[PDB]
Every structure is written in structure tokens, then in C-alpha cells.
């Protein structure tokens, strides 16, 4: 309903404060997002 | 100031004063000063004169292409009511 949209890089972050960290720990992130590409209005065909 | 008669304040510091020195002289300074090292026209900085973008706008390029092609299915004929 209110997508994370920073206008500046990193204005917003996802946070995880771990209690225990094993060897080779990592966070695998997955994102769904919208972003603008471009449109024009022309075509032709004659036969 | 108060003066009190008959003990009056001396009418001056008088002539019994001890001239202690003739060291009164400041010798004028005479000097020639030259600050002449070769100057090179340039200074290096990390950045001068830039007005950096705080946010950019979104920007884009554009394309279209294709042709006009179609597969269609139509409504059947119907009895005409009036007219």
C-alpha cells in the first residue's frame, strides 16, 4: 500500500539484529518492485 | 582630589627626582622584504565548483515497434426490431 521509495540511495534499509551468528552466515534478500523503463504512438503497414 | 590645610598635598613632585636612564630611544627599523618564489598556476582539489545532485529524476529512452495484425470473432446476426 505504501511502497518503500527513497529518492536518495539508502534512505531506507531492512534491518536484522542477529542473536547468534554461525560461520558463513548471510541474508538472502528477495524484492518485488515497480520502476519506470519509455512510450511513443506510431506504426504502419501497407500491402 | 582632596587637599587638606594645613597638611597640604605637595604642590608638585619636585626636582629631587632620580632620572634613571637615557634609554629612551627606539631605533627606527630599516628593512627590504622580498617574497618571490615561483608561483605555478594550479592547485589540486577533490572537488571544486560542483552542485551535486541530491536526487535525480527518473530518466528514460523509448521504442515501439510492430504491425497491425488480428484474429476476430463477431456477434451473430439478429432480427431487427423497429424502423
Which of A38, A41, A42, A46 is the mutation pick for testing B, counting most B CBs within 10 A? A38
Triad A43, A46, A47: Cα angle to 5°: 145
The number of C-alpha atoms within 13 Å of A26 and in the hemisphere containing its C-beta is 3
Would the CA dihedral through A37, A38, A42, A46 be positive or negative? negative
Resolution in A: 4.2
Question: CB B54 to CB A8 under 8 A?
Answer: yes
User: According to the entry, how was the structure determined?
Assistant: X-ray
Residues of B in contact with A9 (CB under 8 A): none
Query: Which cell is A41 given?
Result: 504512438
Would the CA dihedral through A33, A38, A41, A44 be positive or negative? negative
User: Could you tell me which chain A residue has the CA closest to the CA of B62?
Assistant: A38
CB-CB contact of B9 with B3 (8 Å): yes
φ/ψ region of B49 (left if φ > 0, alpha if ψ in -120 to 50, else beta) reads: left
Question: CB A43 to CB B68 under 8 A?
Answer: yes
CB-CB contact of B60 with A38 (8 Å): yes
φ, ψ for residue A22 (rounded to 5)?
-85, 175
Amino acid at each position: 500500500d505504501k511502497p518503500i521509495y527513497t529518492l536518495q540511495y539508502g534512505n531506507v534499509g531492512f534491518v536484522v539484529n542477529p542473536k547468534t551468528v554461525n560461520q558463513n552466515a548471510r541474508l538472502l534478500m528477495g524484492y518485488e518492485y515497480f520502476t519506470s523503463r519509455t512510450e511513443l504512438v506510431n506504426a504502419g503497414t501497407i500491402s | 582630589a582632596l587637599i587638606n590645610p594645613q597638611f597640604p598635598y605637595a604642590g608638585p613632585v619636585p626636582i629631587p627626582g632620580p632620572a634613571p636612564t637615557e634609554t629612551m630611544p627606539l631605533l627606527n627599523y630599516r628593512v627590504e622584504g622580498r617574497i618571490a618564489g615561483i608561483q605555478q598556476a594550479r592547485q589540486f582539489m577533490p572537488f571544486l565548483q560542483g552542485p551535486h545532485r541530491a536526487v535525480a529524476e527518473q530518466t528514460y529512452h523509448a521504442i515501439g515497434t510492430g504491425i497491425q495484425m488480428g484474429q476476430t470473432f463477431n456477434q451473430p446476426l439478429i432480427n431487427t426490431q423497429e424502423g
